[PDB]
Amino acid sequence: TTALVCDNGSGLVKAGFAGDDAPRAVFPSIVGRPRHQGVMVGMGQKDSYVGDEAQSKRGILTLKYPIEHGIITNWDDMEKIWHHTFYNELRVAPEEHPTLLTEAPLNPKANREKMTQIMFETFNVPAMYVAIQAVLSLYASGRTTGIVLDSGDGVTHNVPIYEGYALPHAIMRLDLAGRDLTDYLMKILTERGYSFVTTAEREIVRDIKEKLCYVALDFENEMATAASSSSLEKSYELPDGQVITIGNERFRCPETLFQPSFIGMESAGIHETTYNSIMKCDIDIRKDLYANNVMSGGTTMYPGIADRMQKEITALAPSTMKIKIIAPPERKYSVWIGGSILASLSTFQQMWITKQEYDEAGPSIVHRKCF
Amino acid sequence: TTALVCDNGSGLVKAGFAGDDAPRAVFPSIVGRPRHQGVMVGMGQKDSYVGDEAQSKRGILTLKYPIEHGIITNWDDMEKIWHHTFYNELRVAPEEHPTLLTEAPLNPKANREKMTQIMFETFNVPAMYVAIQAVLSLYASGRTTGIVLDSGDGVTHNVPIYEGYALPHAIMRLDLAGRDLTDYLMKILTERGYSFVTTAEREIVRDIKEKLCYVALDFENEMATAASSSSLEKSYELPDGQVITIGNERFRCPETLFQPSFIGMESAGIHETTYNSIMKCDIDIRKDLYANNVMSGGTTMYPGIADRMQKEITALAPSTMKIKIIAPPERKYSVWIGGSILASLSTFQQMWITKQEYDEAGPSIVHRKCF
Amino acid sequence: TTALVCDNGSGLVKAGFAGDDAPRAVFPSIVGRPRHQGVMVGMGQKDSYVGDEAQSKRGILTLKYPIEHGIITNWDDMEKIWHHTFYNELRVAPEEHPTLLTEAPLNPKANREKMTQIMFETFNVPAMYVAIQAVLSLYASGRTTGIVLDSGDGVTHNVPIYEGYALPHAIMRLDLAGRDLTDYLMKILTERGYSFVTTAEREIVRDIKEKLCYVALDFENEMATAASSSSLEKSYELPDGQVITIGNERFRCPETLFQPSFIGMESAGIHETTYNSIMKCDIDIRKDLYANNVMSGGTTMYPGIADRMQKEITALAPSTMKIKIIAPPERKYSVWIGGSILASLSTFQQMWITKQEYDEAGPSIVHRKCF
Amino acid sequence: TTALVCDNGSGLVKAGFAGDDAPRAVFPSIVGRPRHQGVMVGMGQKDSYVGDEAQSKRGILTLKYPIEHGIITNWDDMEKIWHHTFYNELRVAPEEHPTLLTEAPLNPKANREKMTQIMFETFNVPAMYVAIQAVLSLYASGRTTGIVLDSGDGVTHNVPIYEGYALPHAIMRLDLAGRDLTDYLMKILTERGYSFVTTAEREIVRDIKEKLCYVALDFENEMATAASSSSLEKSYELPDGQVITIGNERFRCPETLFQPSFIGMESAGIHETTYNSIMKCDIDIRKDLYANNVMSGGTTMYPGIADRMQKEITALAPSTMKIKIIAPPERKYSVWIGGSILASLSTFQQMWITKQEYDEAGPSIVHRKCF
Amino acid sequence: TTALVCDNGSGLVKAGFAGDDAPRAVFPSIVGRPRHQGVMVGMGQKDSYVGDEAQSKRGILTLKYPIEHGIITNWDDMEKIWHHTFYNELRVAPEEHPTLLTEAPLNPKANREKMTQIMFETFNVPAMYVAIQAVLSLYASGRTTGIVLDSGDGVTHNVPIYEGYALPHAIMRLDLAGRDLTDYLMKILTERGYSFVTTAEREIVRDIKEKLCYVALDFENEMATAASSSSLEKSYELPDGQVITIGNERFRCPETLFQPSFIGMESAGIHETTYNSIMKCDIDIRKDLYANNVMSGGTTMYPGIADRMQKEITALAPSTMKIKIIAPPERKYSVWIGGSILASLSTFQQMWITKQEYDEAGPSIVHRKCF
Ligand SMILES: C/C1=C\CC[C@H](C)OC(=O)C[C@H](c2ccc(O)cc2)NC(=O)[C@@H](Cc2c[nH]c3ccccc23)N(C)C(=O)[C@H](CCCCN)NC(=O)[C@@H](C)C1
Ligand SMILES: Nc1ncnc2c1ncn2[C@@H]1O[C@H](COP(=O)(O)OP(=O)(O)O)[C@@H](O)[C@H]1O
Ligand SMILES: Nc1ncnc2c1ncn2[C@@H]1O[C@H](COP(=O)(O)OP(=O)(O)O)[C@@H](O)[C@H]1O
Ligand SMILES: Nc1ncnc2c1ncn2[C@@H]1O[C@H](COP(=O)(O)OP(=O)(O)O)[C@@H](O)[C@H]1O
Ligand SMILES: Nc1ncnc2c1ncn2[C@@H]1O[C@H](COP(=O)(O)OP(=O)(O)O)[C@@H](O)[C@H]1O
Ligand SMILES: Nc1ncnc2c1ncn2[C@@H]1O[C@H](COP(=O)(O)OP(=O)(O)O)[C@@H](O)[C@H]1O
Ligand SMILES: [Mg+2]
Numbered sequence A, B, C, D, E: 001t002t003a004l005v006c007d008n009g010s011g012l013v014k015a016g017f018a019g020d021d022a023p024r025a026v027f028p029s030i031v032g033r034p035r036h037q038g039v040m041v042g043m044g045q046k047d048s049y050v051g052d053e054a055q056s057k058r059g060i061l062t063l064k065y066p067i068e069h070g071i072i073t074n075w076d077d078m079e080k081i082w083h084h085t086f087y088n089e090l091r092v093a094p095e096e097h098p099t100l101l102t103e104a105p106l107n108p109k110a111n112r113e114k115m116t117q118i119m120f121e122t123f124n125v126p127a128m129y130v131a132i133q134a135v136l137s138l139y140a141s142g143r144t145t146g147i148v149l150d151s152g153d154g155v156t157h158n159v160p161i162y163e164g165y166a167l168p169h170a171i172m173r174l175d176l177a178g179r180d181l182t183d184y185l186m187k188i189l190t191e192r193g194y195s196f197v198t199t200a201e202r203e204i205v206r207d208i209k210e211k212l213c214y215v216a217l218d219f220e221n222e223m224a225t226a227a228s229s230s231s232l233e234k235s236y237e238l239p240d241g242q243v244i245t246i247g248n249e250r251f252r253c254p255e256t257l258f259q260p261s262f263i264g265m266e267s268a269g270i271h272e273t274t275y276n277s278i279m280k281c282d283i284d285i286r287k288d289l290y291a292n293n294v295m296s297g298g299t300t301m302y303p304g305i306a307d308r309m310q311k312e313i314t315a316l317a318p319s320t321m322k323i324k325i326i327a328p329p330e331r332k333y334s335v336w337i338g339g340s341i342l343a344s345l346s347t348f349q350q351m352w353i354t355k356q357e358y359d360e361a362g363p364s365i366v367h368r369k370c371f
């Protein structure tokens, strides 16, 4: 019965089977609650919508994510989703086969531990394993050496691996991610009278940025040219047919990844976060890391993110260092892909945590890391 | 013994049984009082006529409605009618079975509360329920999503429902209704020497408008073409054989629904009342509301009301929004039909307020709303 | 050559010049036709008497009013009168100067239109204007805010004006007027054997009521005290010296204005007609209207009409509202006075409809209303 | 000639001179248009009333605000007002001296830009400056550190300032404001049969809430005690002397500020809006912000708003944090007061935008922000 | 006018006068820059805060150290501090008297040279001298023989002195110091959801470790006992009242000094660094060094650092060697104390480098070392 791979991340959940080349089910990790009145209850109707069903009824629901900044903040809702994923969407009964879950590095221990508990107690998972998202992304590329820049709506992080050996001590992690980009866009659009405020509207704004936003190659020049009407300006058609003129914001929003101060984020831009994480490692390694900068995660789907990353990291490094950014198609699936690969590996099977094994050992087992 | 459905609205009362496809008894909610002399009393004769009996003797009675603008202004008379409805007209003894009553949203609480009191104290109703007229209208259509424009002689109102979930916060209500249309017609006909002034005459005028009036598709053009004698002009034959030439008024009266200022009504025309009520709701919903504009209530029987509504709402909305007005046959029965349907529902039975239940709880129970 | 002001109302015609403080000619709008035999024709003699000449020969003429309920019912006769007014009585040739005519609001359009036609075609009027009687009455008072209760033998009506701005939408009009009072008096006097039946006799009865009738302050008490012989009873001396004892009728006739049902008039008494017309207007206005109740028109010459009006309107209104009825001397001339004033205004001259202007434009021009 | 300070906000305009301790002229930013008929035009009379003159004639005008939600929606009308303010009401000729204008943060750029344009092109303003309302409010208090909760009928917003340094990144803004409170009150009063619907009536309702409404300290308990007749109930005397019994609504209306869902406002109550805005800022700052919660703006004149705010914010914060709400007298003038102070500052003079300076630079200059 | 002693180290600057028993001024060598917005400039306000003033305004500043790992990385900022130290904080004018500066051994020559330059060119220092921190520490103890383990937030180093004669050839130096401990603590606290990321927050974390951290005597046993809730766990109260539960980390952070690999530091723990530095020296000396292990510097304020150091160094050495660690009170002032002593010595005066002397000789003079 093989095994199930579930990219239970923030934003979207991507699930499919070990051995598949792509997730079979992709949908938002969103729980929607009937906003007006109470619910109905007596006439059924529903007091809870999940993912794409929440999207169908979006406008009458208060939308909540259970995961924020890579952390399961609302366990009740997350549990509800998990059920709705493989149990309802994939037509899978827990006990049929074991499953792979993921998380971003440097989470609170409790995040992983409680997640595990649920898999074994709420569900009948017959063996489970948790892996670092960035690591999986590298597996998807097939490389054994490089920097993984994994950036979603939850978190942005850098993992450094060299010839199969990870370097724990230099892993970087930022709260700065897609939701901050989204929130910033909601804010910045008030400059032109386009006030989005509800959770439902927030999702529209996300739709906008995923279609129109791009990374300024040279922000200064883009701002200069933005003083003149041009191809910069786009007309976004809303759900109710009214249209929005997007100007400078089309690139100013992505800009925040390189100038975090825009949103109050007292930090370094991702080009420096990356640079510095490389600087933290031995000089004997750095040369290779430079030429294997694997970029993945949905925020890296912005057009030009690779081009400008290349530009700025090149500027920071010595001119004699050759830098190469890897940015394949399907970056949005990279982690999941890695998972499919991982689970299909013969050797890997020894890493499974059997429910019984867990029951015998207890919580702490989920942090073991041999490979 | 099933249950009784009673559309106890202003204007007309339409009663029949739960499970019927149409009301069995339809008649005016009018109380007539012998105008000349006193009454008779000693020789019987009668000091009160109701509905169709008042119509028979119309010309010697002062006619009063007990309900005005959806509010039971004269309880004595309304009580008298209720008796005369099911007790006399339908041949029903209260206690045989429970009954469904209706009202327009945003009434004074006392309207519902006192009505309830009477059902349980004056009559022996063994369980009673009150429903919003617009909601019922939507049930009659069978849709779960849309705008209900319910307009009678009492009030005009807009209710927005989405996929089974009502949106309380955006319900609109106007005093502007059929009696204002009627009163205006009485007034406007003095332009041609046709002065109607009594309550009895008022009813004639109502008869006129229900036969000849129509909604101008393009009011301006109709006024222009009205400068020439044509098919516009009609000869109405009065009760005593004298005839009336109706001109421009044939459409100028319905015009007031779109230009309320004609009667001093500082408001927005119903095309804007509708438009705005949609604007009040989330952009994620508006698209669907546009395509499910359910129009019902007797004033919507004017020929062309749908055509022009379509025209003007289309003009207000974006050209990319598809708008569809639903305007079935039997719009005049829609609310009652919905009631028959509602009462026939198995689930619905839990909503009944048992007389005992009321007696135990008290007044406030009539505003509970779970479903 | 200034201009001519003509209060061409029902009952009496009052004409004088713009700038005069009172009409120069006042006489009945009555056409009398030799009742017995034919006429004479061959020996001249006359087949038509008008106004005061008809009064001279009253007893051998059938008297007809051309205007009834404010409407020119008999154009032939009205035309004849108009000639006899300014042409014969005032010694004026049409073309010397323009003229102001009046009418009660809510007349049939044709009333005004045909009147206009005659002024320009039968006569040589070099510019003409028609004004609402009530409006003019307010001008005579000099106020810019108030209720005008204008009541003659033709009609009774209420006009509401606020700070120079009329409120069309709340104008009230009743058929109930002086001729109904007169007719009722003719009828009620048969109780004591004083049967008046001819048109000539009708005029006597009018003379009676204009001398003896008064408004009961408290009708109930007056009826009670009327059971005892007192100052109530008066001896009216007829044209032939016989005398009439008037009792209760002396106030019971005016009573009908407050209890219209007495004459079959299914309506509200004038105290409620007034009250309600105020209720029809915005709460922000009503307070002022209460304190500016301008009463005018000949029927308001009954002693006590103001006192009782005050009483009953006060009762209807809230005790905190201050009510003041204006009832100057010369109420019988108020409309005409207003006309004199109006015509003397510099600004007003732009309102004249030049004969040529009319000829060019046509009928419809008489309903323009800019000021 | 000093300078002019003009709190050109929504609702009311408060103008006075730099150095004054209070505005000299305070009046509604309302434009009224003769509702019935047309206007008059030819006889003058007026086709436009502003502020207190519109209040005088309130009942015959359609009242419009030009500013809605802090945005000048109707420039024609706003221009008209500006003229009527200092030009007519204060007896000031533009060019005599420079002026200070204000606006709520996060407005559309065009709001400020167009406003500027008018000051320099329509008027002869010799130097102008625009400031954030909340900032000015803090200046009025004299503090350099704190939270400014500025809430009017337009918008509600939170600004955080620390030791003279603003924190742009954590400014909050809500549409939820006084007009929503007012509109809600209009609606909620239909429960007791007090239907207010016109723009004129809306102003009455505002008058009601400004006199009777208060903030429930414990809403639940107030609702419980509201089941019994008590001091809760008040008799409001309307403009026409009729009285209104206000019950639960007297506090249920203010309740919406803490439970926005009441009006469909999918948001957080102002106690959480405030709390969260503090949470958005560094832990090293939060302690001070807690003890300097400066509340201002006219909606904060509701009795008990401070008491309950204190209660709920205290509950949300840790028990060890000391919280202090500043709520001086003259909260309604706070912004203007700050303006007077600001303009009187020597240093501040460098911030003026000279008309010439603007003409040379152009639009963008109005968003400069050095201090 | 005596002389000034300035422990211009990383972390804190401790200044006082030659002859004093303790520094008069102690404050952080931190420069803070207004993080949000720009600054203010025009209204003054300040664009730079130093030490305790930066602490006052901590939360709105980006905090930077100018010294890192014992090296003045940012000269601009360090210069600024020096001014703010004696010039502003101590109320001293440079030229009043000569001054003693310090540094950690094995710095880049330029560190000392540039520092000197500034003292003579930026300031008017009339003679200056630079001494090795460890040497001074030994002077403070009063011993002439021993190992000085001087460990601050900048660097950790070992100096060996025997009977007044230093042994240059065996001086050890590590980057591993207090900031690594601090940074590690920031990281390790994410295990329990306590994410500190800003420079301001970093300072809080430092405050935490300086209050709660201690050195595990037996790390293994502490980890074992840490599996059970006990006295290990502490509740730290943050600046905003929220509390933090510190567990294992309370000793795991100090552990890194003995197992540097925890932070990627491929080195030997300080117990072996010390041991080995002794091994590097002649067997005829080692015996004495063992009995005079002078520990100083702020990181040695962790409770138990002496106890465990004793334990582990004893284990490494032969059982017959007597080992004694000196760990007086005021270890945090040791270097400065030594400086006060040094400057007060008569003989020592010959070591001063006169400004003129420097000007004549040039840069190289600062590395002379006779005594
Ligand atoms: C409508 C929408 C996007 C499309 C806007 C429309 C199609 O285009 C415009 O009309 C531009 C037009 C505009 C153009 C030019 C100009 O100088 C001043 C204003 N924007 C406004 O007026 C603002 C008015 C407004 C109210 N608070 C605000 C807060 C900030 C900014 C604006 C507003 N405005 C459209 C909205 O607020 C509305 C209502 C706000 C939602 C919650 N209440 N917005 C929305 O509901 C969502 C769907 C976003
Ligand atoms: N076309 C796109 N352009 C930019 N960002 C995108 C695009 N599609 C998705 N994203 C962003 O990627 C994130 C969602 O996908 P993903 O990053 O895979 O989520 P997660 O990594 O949390 O599973 C969001 O930030 C989303 O907006
Ligand atoms: N043929 C018609 N054309 C227009 N209006 C009609 C017609 N028949 C009935 N009406 C109007 O509908 C109202 C009466 O029916 P209805 O609206 O159902 O009353 P209610 O809704 O109050 O029960 C009146 O306004 C009536 O004039
Ligand atoms: N003394 C009076 N008392 C009561 N009514 C009078 C008196 N004089 C005239 N009227 C009434 O006024 C009307 C005639 O004058 P008027 O009202 O001015 O006529 P009109 O208004 O039609 O020009 C008649 O109803 C007449 O009886
Ligand atoms: N006594 C009061 N109680 C409550 N609210 C008030 C009171 N007086 C004024 N307000 C409200 O304050 C707003 C008007 O004053 P203000 O808030 O200063 O307007 P703005 O801030 O837009 O200038 C309105 O919401 C008004 O109802
Ligand atoms: N109570 C304490 N416990 C542990 N370390 C401390 C304590 N107080 C200060 N320190 C550490 O000492 C260093 C600061 O003082 P110090 O070591 O004298 O600085 P420096 O030596 O650079 O002048 C920092 O590492 C600081 O955290
Ligand atoms: Mg991801």
Ligand SMILES: [Mg+2]
Pocket (backbone or CB within 6 Å): B009, B133, B150, B151, B152, B153, B297, B298, B335
């Ligand atoms: Mg109906």
Ligand SMILES: [Mg+2]
Pocket (backbone or CB within 6 Å): C009, C133, C150, C151, C152, C153, C297, C298, C335
């Ligand atoms: Mg008259």
Ligand SMILES: [Mg+2]
Pocket (backbone or CB within 6 Å): D009, D133, D150, D151, D152, D153, D297, D298, D335
């Ligand atoms: Mg304000």
Ligand SMILES: [Mg+2]
Pocket (backbone or CB within 6 Å): E009, E133, E150, E151, E152, E153, E297, E298, E335
């Ligand atoms: Mg040190």
